């Protein structure tokens, strides 16, 4: 019920072999950047998978910028 | 010669006349003849740092026979209180027999022994043998039939006694 | 340096007693050696036992100059005070509690005696508490407050009145049971609550006070000890725990005994006071930091400290324990209190790396308590939802991370000290064999399991941490930096114990890498010791994670060649490491084993059994037995029946041969069965059989029929043998070798009949084919067998098939008995303690045969169960525990039998009836039954409520129809008052109406039993006051009252 | 032996002491720089090899900068040696593809057992990263220069 969801994720995981990193710097540097959106993509799909019946868990992951950031605020050193 | 007043105590035919007997000569007694009062044996180790005598006062666990009882107590060195794993009355007398042996020697070294851990079928399950922590006393899970840690708690009151944890029994 | 007789001319009242000569006597018990001593033991226990010697003690203890001879004095004195105190004229009570008074107020008015006799005035203290629990609070109620203005008047008195009150509160609350009856045991509860006050003022005016260390000492002491009972308002609601923390806890001559009431406190479970427990803490930590700091090597403060400073470390450890179990929740939601509560988690983590295993027991203790906490709230999530990489930070339940800085280090600790999983001695069986043991349930397994359980839970909240650390560690040992056997051994045993505890994938892979990386360690290594090391560690590895070896059957075949491989290796251990490894593969692989795998066209076991004899060329006797038996595992998991016989035909093949070629060569004579070294062939391969047939099991027979009949001859070829040897030299002959090895071949027939029994399923073909030969071979020569012939392992063994036979057996039991009964009890019926292996398993078939036999019992003669029942009274007279529990089980189940049997149950009563309630009696009024007691109540109860239920429809007394309870009452009151005639009638009719009344209490009929007991070992005069007989009276109406709305309801 | 705490002997010890542990270091940075191509590639070494490492992390942790830059650079050298060929195979060594992560350098395997010790020696004494001074100038202002390109 839940392994097969985890199977999937660690499958999506080995299903992209990265790129094979040949070339100049420019070249390079546009594998790197392809291979970044491939990793958005995989991370995409992961978050809505959870979001289909994990969601309920895994929500706040992006939503944590702003309880980050009610605790970056409240810094008050009213004593010692 | 270095020896030590050493007295063993705890309910009757649990062991004790047969751990002394299988220290003293090396062979199993399988019968109980039960103690009276108390048996005097000394008993030899050779560690480390030399020759070690305990002078085990095997006393009787049988009230009925308990004769002088904790006068037998008086000027021990060290103390040996030790029960059957396999019947739990012999453990929840166990704080009876530490409370008679406190009251004569406030601060010694003292060894909680569970004889014949061998048997199969245990009772005293190690999870509930717990008085030692409170009281500091040093627990012990033997066996006169499977020999098991059979000098471990005589090596245990011959450091303490004499001061050496480093302290070790040799053979010869 | 004295005779016998001139011992007991002291003995001689009408003469004055030569304290010299005492003081002789007793310098040689406490100096002197072997008859001497034992002689003096002996007159002063008779001495001790007399009636009139407290005569002299007063005279004693005026003269006395050795301590000793006044300990024993007083030792007299505490037996007379224990007995005779309601029978002792007034006058001379008083007179005497008046002269120990004053010796107690001179002793304490000298400091030098007051160090010099420290025991004999604890021993005055326990002697005038026994007056007092005679006395107090009846005959000097004003003693408390007395004392207590004494207390104020000196420093010395007031600490002996502390250390008196402390030797009161222990023998009111923590010694009172088996002691003292329930009702003076809680009237005398309630007095000193009610005059607790006064005490718990004068130990704060003490504490705040006092400057005698020594003194404040006892006063923390007598304060400890009064912390078991005492109300919580005295505790909660004054300046004491402060007191404590500030004035003594930071003192090393109190921080001791101080820290140990603080843990008796941390262990109150109520919230009436939670602030309060938050304050101790606070201060408590501050306290501590102050004393000891946090960056302390609390092990090497340890090794190097002494027994003071072990012991507090200790306490510290246990308060920590106790005070975190109990009020987690409570410091969770203070953030403020955020910080401390880290620093008492540091603290258990500088304990933890202690060289003491009590130390680490404790700290284990706190550990699997959190973790079970954290267990039992991360699986909701982590369990029953999905995970990913880093995803359980995410999911985290807002508890777990108060603890999760601490996690990491957890389970380093645990990977680090984790203890061997099992335990293996090599042991001398009686026979001279010197064989390996698997230790069970001993305390290091339970370490094992405990520790085993804790980081399976940390790994299941946060496992790949935990398998960063073990790679991490692995690492460690292949750089070197952490080389050493016993590292790595840890590691492996860490790693094995957490089986089971990752997904099928995370397992697979870090099983990969780390063989991975032990492979390359064993090549990088050099030297035989350390290789052989590293395999056996990675042989145990891979038998801990069965899963693995179950998914890649080319895995486990290479393993098992290797195994092969190794087996004929000779260093130490070797060998018997992959015989180990090799069990464990069949029991958790025997499907695959089996099973034909892949790329295979047979089953490995084929090979396996073609190439035994070259595997086994350099093996010994023991690891031949242990791979025998594994291949009985893998033998067993067969299902075709026919392939499966095969398969063990094939499989005894070379112990089939031996065995054939022994019995033609003892069918052309008998004398080879003394060859020494036939004897131990037979040894070898009756232990091959032994654990073939545990292994395989039922269909083992198959194999067992092929020898059955043959061996059974055997067996009488050996009896006899034996008995004329014996014969020749008596039970000498038996030490010797030959003699040795006969009975273990007799021992080892014996264990494998009972081995193949105790698994059959067809009980019908095993009545009929089995025991007859049996009954000719055996029992017929056992009982043609001389005594110390007779070998114990026959009984119980025969109990053994009745236990599994029941009443396919029944009609065979008469023949047993006739053969083996009064034989053995002839051998066992004269006294208690020889032949103990007989008594026991004699009584373990009579119990056996009680419980699945009974017709038998039907269809005796009655003189033979009359017979069966005088050996059973004969049993739970026993001493040997064991055989007494034996006995009662077996009378209990018997009566729960006959009352099955409506016919027989009135006859057999009134046969035996009032003689049963003799004897068991007259063991329960004896002391050294006391273990028994919970059984002997279990059946009195029945007993007594048989009586009440009017099941025994006849009169006990056919001369007269009276109510069988009257009738009992009479005769049992009779009985004990003939028994003890010094004791009150009223207390016996109580006790009587009480059983009764208490037949379905059974802990209040166990307690009326203990109380009854206490009263018979006091004279017990006319003076009633003591004995609260009213109000037990009450509390056993009200208990009548309550059993028979229980039969109401019912 | 390899089990002393250099830094406490570096600490206590005195000026020969000092100056054998600051050689050996020298010895091993130089012959490790010039020659771990041809130490890597035999295996009865490897254990040797892996002493020899062993000994710089704990001379690393000598309470002397000098040391310490020595020991930093011969860490450097071998990172640069370590030349990530793929280092989207470090990117594979998570969940990602294991193929590619197990294509790994057999360099990079034989220091793996070393890899992360040099990870937590560099994070446990990194040095400051930049450096303010407080500076009077001629007119007596007092200011706070930044330094630039020292030592430091």
Known sequence: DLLKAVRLIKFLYQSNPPPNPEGTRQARRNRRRRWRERQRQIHSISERILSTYLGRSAEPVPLQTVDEMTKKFGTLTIDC | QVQFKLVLVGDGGTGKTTFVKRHLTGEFEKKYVATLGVEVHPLVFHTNRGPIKFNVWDTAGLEKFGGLRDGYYIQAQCAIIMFDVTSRVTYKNVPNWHRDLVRVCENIPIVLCGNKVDIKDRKVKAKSIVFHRKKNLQYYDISAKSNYNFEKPFLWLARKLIGDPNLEFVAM | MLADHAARQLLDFSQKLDINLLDNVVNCLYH?????????????????????????????????????????????????????????????????????????????????????????????????????????????????????????????????????????????????????????????????????????????????????????????????????????????????????????????????????????????????????????????????????????????????????????????????????????????????????????????????????????????????????????????????????????????????????????????????????????????????????????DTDSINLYKNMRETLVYLTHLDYVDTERIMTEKLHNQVNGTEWSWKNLNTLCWAIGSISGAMHEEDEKRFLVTVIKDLLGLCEQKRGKDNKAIIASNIMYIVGQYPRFLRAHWKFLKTVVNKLFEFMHETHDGVQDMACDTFIKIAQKCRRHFVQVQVGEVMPFIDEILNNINTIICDLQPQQVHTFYEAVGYMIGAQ?????????????????????????????????????????????????????????????????????????????????????????????????????????????????????????????????????????????????????????????????????????????????????????????????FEEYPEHRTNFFLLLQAVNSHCFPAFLAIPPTQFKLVLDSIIWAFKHTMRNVADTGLQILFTLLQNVAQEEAAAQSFYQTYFCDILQHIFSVVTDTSHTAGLTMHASILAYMFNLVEEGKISTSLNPGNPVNNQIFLQEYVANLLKSAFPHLQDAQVKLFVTGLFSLNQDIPAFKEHLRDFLVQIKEFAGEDTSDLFLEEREIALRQADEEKHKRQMSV
């Open chain 3, 639 to 831: 299902t075709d029946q026919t392939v499966q016989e095969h398969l063990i035909e094939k499989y005894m093949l070379l112990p089939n041969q031996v065995w054939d070629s022994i019995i033609q060569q003892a069918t052309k004579n008998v004398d080879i069965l003394k060859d020494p070294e036939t004897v131990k062939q037979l040894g070898s391969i009756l232990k091959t059989n032994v654990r073939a047939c545990k292994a395989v099991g039922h269909p083992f027979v198959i194999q067992l029929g092929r020898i059955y009949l043959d061996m059974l001859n055997v067996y009488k070829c050996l009896s006899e043998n034996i008995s004329a040897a014996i014969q020749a030299n008596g039970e000498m002959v038996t030490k010797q070798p030959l003699i040795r090895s006969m009975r273990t071949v007799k021992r080892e027939t014996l264990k494998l009949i009972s081995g193949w029994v105790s698994r059959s399923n067809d009980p019908q073909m095993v009545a009929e084919n089995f025991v007859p030969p049996l009954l000719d071979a055996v029992l017929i020569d056992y009982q043609r067998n001389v005594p110390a012939a007779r070998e114990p392992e026959v009984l119980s063994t025969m109990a053994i098939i009745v236990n599994k036979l029941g009443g396919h057996i029944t009609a065979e039991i008469p023949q047993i008995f006739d053969a083996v009964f009064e034989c053995t009890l002839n051998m066992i019926n004269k006294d």
């Open chain 3, 32 to 440: 002197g050696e072997g008859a001497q001593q034992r002689m003096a033991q002996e007159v002063l226990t008779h001495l001790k036992e007399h009636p009139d010697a407290w005569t002299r003690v007063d005279t004693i203890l005026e003269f006395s100059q050795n301590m000793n001879t006044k300990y024993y004095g007083l030792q007299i004195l505490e037996n007379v005070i224990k007995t005779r105190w309601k029978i002792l004229p007034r006058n001379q009570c008083e007179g005497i509690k008046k002269y120990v008074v004053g010796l107690i107020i001179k002793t304490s008015s000298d400091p030098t005696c007051v160090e010099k006799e420290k025991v004999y005035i604890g021993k005055l203290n326990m002697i005038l508490v026994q007056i007092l629990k005679q006395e107090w609070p009846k005959h000097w109620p004003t003693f408390i407050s007395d004392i207590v203005g004494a207390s104020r008047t000196s420093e010395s008195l007031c600490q002996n009145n502390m250390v008196i009150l402390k030797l009161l509160s222990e023998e009111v609350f923590d010694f009172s049971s088996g002691q003292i009856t329930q009702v003076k045991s809680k009237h005398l509860k309630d007095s000193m609550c009610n005059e607790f006050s006064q005490i718990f003022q004068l130990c704060q005016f003490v504490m705040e006070n006092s400057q005698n260390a020594p003194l404040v000492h006892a006063t923390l002491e007598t304060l400890l000890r009064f912390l078991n009972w005492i109300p919580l308002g005295y505790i909660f609601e004054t300046k004491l725990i402060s007191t404590l923390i500030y004035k003594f806890l930071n003192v090393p001559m109190f921080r001791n005994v101080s820290l140990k009431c603080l843990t008796e406190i941390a262990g109150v479970s109520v919230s009436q006071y939670e602030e309060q427990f938050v304050t101790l803490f606070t201060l408590t930590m501050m306290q501590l930091k102050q004393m000891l700091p946090l960056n302390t090597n609390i092990r090497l403060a340890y090794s190097n400290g002494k027994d003071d400073e072990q012991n507090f470390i200790q306490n510290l450890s246990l308060f920590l324990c106790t005070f975190l179990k109990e009020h987690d929740q409570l410091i969770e939601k203070r953030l403020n209190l955020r910080e401390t509560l880290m620093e008492a988690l540091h603290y258990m983590l500088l304990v933890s790396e202690v060289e003491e295993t009590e130390i680490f027991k404790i700290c284990l203790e706190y550990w699997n308590h959190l973790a079970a906490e954290l267990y039992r709230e991360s699986p909701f999530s982590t369990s029953a939802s999905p995970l990913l990489s880093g995803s359980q930070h995410f999911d985290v339940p807002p508890r777990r991370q108060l603890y999760l800085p601490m996690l990491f280090k957890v389970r380093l600790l645990m990977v680090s000290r984790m203890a061997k999983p099992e335990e293996v001695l090599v042991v001398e069986n009686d026979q001279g064999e010197v064989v390996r043991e698997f230790m069970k």
